[PDB]
Design a protein around this nucleic acid. Structure first.
Ligand SMILES: [Mg+2]
Ligand SMILES: [Mg+2]
Ligand SMILES: [Mg+2]
Ligand SMILES: [Mg+2]
Ligand SMILES: [Mg+2]
Ligand SMILES: [Mg+2]
Ligand SMILES: [Mg+2]
Ligand SMILES: [Mg+2]
Ligand SMILES: [Mg+2]
Ligand SMILES: [Mg+2]
Ligand SMILES: [Mg+2]
Ligand SMILES: [Mg+2]
Ligand SMILES: [Mg+2]
Ligand SMILES: [Mg+2]
Ligand SMILES: [Mg+2]
Ligand SMILES: [Mg+2]
Ligand SMILES: [Mg+2]
Ligand SMILES: [Mg+2]
Ligand SMILES: [Mg+2]
Ligand SMILES: [Mg+2]
Ligand SMILES: [Mg+2]
Ligand SMILES: [Mg+2]
Ligand SMILES: [Mg+2]
Ligand SMILES: [Mg+2]
Ligand SMILES: [Mg+2]
Ligand SMILES: [Mg+2]
Ligand SMILES: [Mg+2]
Ligand SMILES: [Mg+2]
Ligand SMILES: [Mg+2]
Ligand SMILES: [Mg+2]
Ligand SMILES: [Mg+2]
Ligand SMILES: [Mg+2]
Ligand SMILES: [Mg+2]
Ligand SMILES: [Mg+2]
Ligand SMILES: [Mg+2]
Ligand SMILES: [Mg+2]
Ligand SMILES: [Mg+2]
Ligand SMILES: [Mg+2]
Ligand SMILES: [Mg+2]
Ligand SMILES: [Mg+2]
Ligand SMILES: [Mg+2]
Ligand SMILES: [Mg+2]
Ligand SMILES: [Mg+2]
Ligand SMILES: [Mg+2]
Ligand SMILES: [Mg+2]
Ligand SMILES: [Mg+2]
Ligand SMILES: [Mg+2]
Ligand SMILES: [Mg+2]
Ligand SMILES: [Mg+2]
Ligand SMILES: [Mg+2]
Ligand SMILES: [Mg+2]
Ligand SMILES: [Mg+2]
Ligand SMILES: [Mg+2]
Ligand SMILES: [Mg+2]
Ligand SMILES: [Mg+2]
Ligand SMILES: [Mg+2]
Ligand SMILES: [Mg+2]
Ligand SMILES: [Mg+2]
Ligand SMILES: [Mg+2]
Ligand SMILES: [Mg+2]
Ligand SMILES: [Mg+2]
Ligand SMILES: [Mg+2]
Ligand SMILES: [Mg+2]
Ligand SMILES: [Mg+2]
Ligand SMILES: [Mg+2]
Ligand SMILES: [Mg+2]
Ligand SMILES: [Mg+2]
Ligand SMILES: [Mg+2]
Ligand SMILES: [Mg+2]
Lengths: 101, 117, 113, 138, 50
RNA sequence: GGGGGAUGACCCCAGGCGGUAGGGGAGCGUUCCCGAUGCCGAUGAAGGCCGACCCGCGAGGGCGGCUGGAGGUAAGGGAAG
RNA sequence: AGGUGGAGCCUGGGAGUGAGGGCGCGAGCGAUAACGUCCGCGUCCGAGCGCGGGAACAACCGAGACCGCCAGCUAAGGCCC
RNA sequence: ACCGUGAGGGAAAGGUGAAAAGAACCCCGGGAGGGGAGUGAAAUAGAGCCUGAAACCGUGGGCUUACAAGCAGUCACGGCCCCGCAAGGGGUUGUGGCGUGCCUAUUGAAGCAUGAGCCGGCGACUCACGGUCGUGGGCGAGCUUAAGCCGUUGAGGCGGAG
């Protein structure tokens, strides 16, 4: 049993009991998110449509992340041009409890 | 007053060299060749960060296309099937379907195969 | 327990002497003794002198028991360089370096259980 | 979600006739099989791919004027050390080597591509090693 | 007023141009003079107002 | 830029944001002075060597451990080898 | 008349530049030669030797790169390996 | 010092410790040097002596490498070693994708055009007096003192020629 969900221009395959980092959304930690958006069943035939209606999955925001820092560097030879910018990209963790059809 | 270099130049050379740890030869041992090698690293990572996107999708496709030629059709038709059929799921990322969940893949093959058929 | 001797400011080039040190490393002191006498290099002398001063330091100091010994460790580091002018054609004058070695023999007791 | 990648797989073995199959057409697939791009676990850095065997190559057929006209070439490091070999001469001397060559050229260049070439075993006429499984194809 | 409270108005100590130090600060290498020729040269030019 | 009217720093919303010569604007760090007959300091100053840790777009600032053995010097401002 | 634009006009402060190149078009010089030379109108490179295509390649085709993503649609050019 | 016939040129080079208490004596050794002993808060403070960076050289350990080809990186996965309860991270690199050094000068450079063996120190937009804009404030039909004079724990004030 599994689903295929949609959050933040992306699609992930979720089990019940799956801790998963997702693009950051707004729920204060411990708040609960049904994401009325779902794309696939794992007992099959239900696929369909963009999105099977009536089904969603529930996950509880564990808290809001800031990822490890990417160093994004830009250099241009012979023109005396260099730039340095630090980047941490905010996320939210989710635990997937149960998937309702 | 006079302000000599003191500790400032030593410290910046130190920053960079630490970054270049692991690089071959003098490129890890000399603040000049480190700063040079680094420049290059900095651009390739950024280049390749836009390339990893290209890189990964490319793989997904071959894998999709591989699996449904087993079921005897194209990739190029397969996507069109899914496009009409509304099944705009795949997000070619989940050809983990195609590997891990075969009969889910098959069911998709037909949900595809019947539109224009 | 382990014993050590270190010769310092030996007037010899490290590269030269480091070569015979390689020759006896991890050897029982009785073979190491044998080799250096019959090894033909100037640096055999100097190294044997250190080996010995470290053999003495074993029994006499650290209570070691001579017939159990082998060479645990050894190496030569580079002490400061003696720089002399060497005059040359068309009045040029280079500088040659007479180099200097710090020789180290470290001794240990072969397991001898 | 991380993309799935395999772990060490069951190495397969396959068989082809080549009699009357033309060439590059036959070589196209032998390549794809060699890398095993048909398997949908497909891995670029890996080398999970079938071991192809070919018989009755030396019976390969070819279109056009190629038998007389087509030329293979080889250079020593030496002066005037370019050799020219007509397709017919090859065939009459080392039949296949021609399929071996058409495939070696369609396999990618690198240490990986050079492994897969080893996994291609070509013989002339019938028979071969009788060891492994070896299912067929047209 | 305390000796720490003192400080000037938001203008009034403006302070001040530098060069030829960073890439970044602009102002580097050629230090605001642009490559060139006589005016970039040390004592530079001939007195423009004439 | 336009709302919310905190009179702006905070919040939505919408746009712009390749760049050499060059113009503009914000900051970082170094030496010194006021702050100082103060404060930190041998239960360890400056400097050094590590860090996968925290804050900052970045220059940097923290913090922890090792070394080191007598100096260091906030907030806020001033001046430059 | 439409046209609110990193548009326009006026006053002032600080510049850099006054060696350009390719290509298309239109002319002269040249030989209806030159990666030739010299003007015009455009373009791009210069400063976009950042990205895709053209095997490789400043200026030809595609397209103006604020950062991130293991999401999607396209461009030119492609879809036997 | 040294260099120059001469006039003349002209450097390098400071630091044990609070105190010499500057290591008796024993051991290897020709001495040098070291090892114990001892001194000391500390001796990798031992006199080639505070701190002791970097190039550079060496020993030991982990990962790796003898059918691959390269501006040496980078993106991916996998192996082995390390740390961690876990998910996780650090190291290393087998394979695969991508990849034409820095600066300078140029129409245009990876360029087979200049510069640089590498590291550490030193090294280049200032100051005076005028000017001219802008800015922060004082006073405003006015504004403002110069020399000097008095006075002063680094105390100011006067002075109206101009
Ligand atoms: Mg370049
Ligand atoms: Mg250029
Ligand atoms: Mg300086
Ligand atoms: Mg894309
Ligand atoms: Mg001679
Ligand atoms: Mg002479
Ligand atoms: Mg030399
Ligand atoms: Mg600039
Ligand atoms: Mg500026
Ligand atoms: Mg200027
Ligand atoms: Mg210049
Ligand atoms: Mg010029
Ligand atoms: Mg002049
Ligand atoms: Mg004039
Ligand atoms: Mg925006
Ligand atoms: Mg910009
Ligand atoms: Mg105290
Ligand atoms: Mg200080
Ligand atoms: Mg201590
Ligand atoms: Mg410290
Ligand atoms: Mg200076
Ligand atoms: Mg109008
Ligand atoms: Mg304008
Ligand atoms: Mg103007
Ligand atoms: Mg001109
Ligand atoms: Mg012209
Ligand atoms: Mg035309
Ligand atoms: Mg022409
Ligand atoms: Mg021309
Ligand atoms: Mg033009
Ligand atoms: Mg130019
Ligand atoms: Mg432009
Ligand atoms: Mg190029
Ligand atoms: Mg290309
Ligand atoms: Mg290409
Ligand atoms: Mg291109
Ligand atoms: Mg281009
Ligand atoms: Mg843009
Ligand atoms: Mg498409
Ligand atoms: Mg093609
Ligand atoms: Mg004399
Ligand atoms: Mg002695
Ligand atoms: Mg004691
Ligand atoms: Mg000692
Ligand atoms: Mg120490
Ligand atoms: Mg000390
Ligand atoms: Mg010394
Ligand atoms: Mg002291
Ligand atoms: Mg010392
Ligand atoms: Mg060192
Ligand atoms: Mg080693
Ligand atoms: Mg071979
Ligand atoms: Mg090998
Ligand atoms: Mg080679
Ligand atoms: Mg690689
Ligand atoms: Mg240069
Ligand atoms: Mg030049
Ligand atoms: Mg030139
Ligand atoms: Mg030229
Ligand atoms: Mg060069
Ligand atoms: Mg070269
Ligand atoms: Mg030359
Ligand atoms: Mg020149
Ligand atoms: Mg330097
Ligand atoms: Mg300076
Ligand atoms: Mg002025
Ligand atoms: Mg003024
Ligand atoms: Mg005023
Ligand atoms: Mg007055």
């Amino acid at each position: 049993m599994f689903a295929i969900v949609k959050t933040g221009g992306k699609q992930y395959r979720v089990e019940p009991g799956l801790k998963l980092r997702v693009e950051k959304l707004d729920a204060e930690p411990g708040a609960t998110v049904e994401l009325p958006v779902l794309l696939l069943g794992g007992e099959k035939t239900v696929v369909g449509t963009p999105v099977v209606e009536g089904a969603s999955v529930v996950a509880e925001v564990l808290g809001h992340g800031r990822g490890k820092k990417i160093l994004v560097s830009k250099f241009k030879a012979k023109v005396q041009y260099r730039r340095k910018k630090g980047h941490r990209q905010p996320y939210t963790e989710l635990l997937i409890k149960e998937i309702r059809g | 007053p006079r302000a000599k270099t003191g500790v400032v130049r030593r410290r910046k050379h130190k920053k960079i060299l630490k970054l270049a740890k692991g690089y071959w030869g003098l490129r890890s041992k000399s603040f000049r060749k480190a700063r040079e090698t680094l420049f290059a690293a900095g651009n390739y990572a950024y280049a390749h960060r836009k390339r990893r996107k290209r890189d990964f999708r490319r793989l997904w496709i071959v894998r999709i296309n591989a699996a449904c030629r087993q079921h005897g059709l194209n990739y190029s038709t397969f996507i069109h099937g899914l496009k009409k059929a509304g099944i705009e799921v795949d997000r070619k990322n989940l050809a983990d379907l195609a590997v891990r969940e075969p009969q889910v893949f098959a069911e998709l093959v037909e949900r595809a195969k019947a539109a224009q058929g | 327990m382990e014993a050590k001797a270190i010769a310092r400011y030996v007037r010899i080039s490290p590269r030269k002497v480091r070569l015979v040190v390689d020759l006896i490393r991890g050897k029982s002191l009785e073979e190491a003794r044998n080799i250096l006498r019959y090894t033909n290099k100037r640096g055999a002398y100097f190294v044997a002198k250190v080996l010995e001063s470290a053999a003495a330091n074993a029994v006499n100091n650290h209570d070691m028991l001579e017939d159990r010994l082998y060479v645990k460790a050894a190496y030569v580091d580079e002490g400061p360089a003696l720089k002399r002018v060497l005059p040359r054609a068309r009045g040029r004058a280079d500088i040659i370096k007479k180099r200097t070695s710090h020789i180290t023999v470290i001794l240990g007791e072969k397991h001898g259980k | 979600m991380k993309t799935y990648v395999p772990k060490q797989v069951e190495p397969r073995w396959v068989l082809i006739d080549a009699e009357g199959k033309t060439l590059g057409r036959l070589a196209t697939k032998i390549a794809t099989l060699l890398r095993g791009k048909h398997r949908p676990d497909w891995t670029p850095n890996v080398a999970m791919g079938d071991f192809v065997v070919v018989v009755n190559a030396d019976k390969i057929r070819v279109t056009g004027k190629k038998l007389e006209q087509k030329i293979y070439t080889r250079y020593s490091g030496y002066p005037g050390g370019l050799k020219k070999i007509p397709l017919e001469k090859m065939l009459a001397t080392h039949p296949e080597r021609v399929l071996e060559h058409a495939v070696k050229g369609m396999l990618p260049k690198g240490p990986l591509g050079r492994r897969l070439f080893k996994r291609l075993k070509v013989y002339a006429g019938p028979d071969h090693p009788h060891q492994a499984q070896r299912p067929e194809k047209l | 007023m305390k000796l720490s409270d003192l400080r000037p108005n938001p203008g009034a100590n403006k302070r001040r141009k530098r060069v030829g130090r960073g890439p970044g600060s602009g102002h580097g290498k050629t230090a605001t003079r642009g490559h060139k020729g006589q005016k970039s040269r040390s004592g530079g030019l001939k007195d423009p107002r004439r």
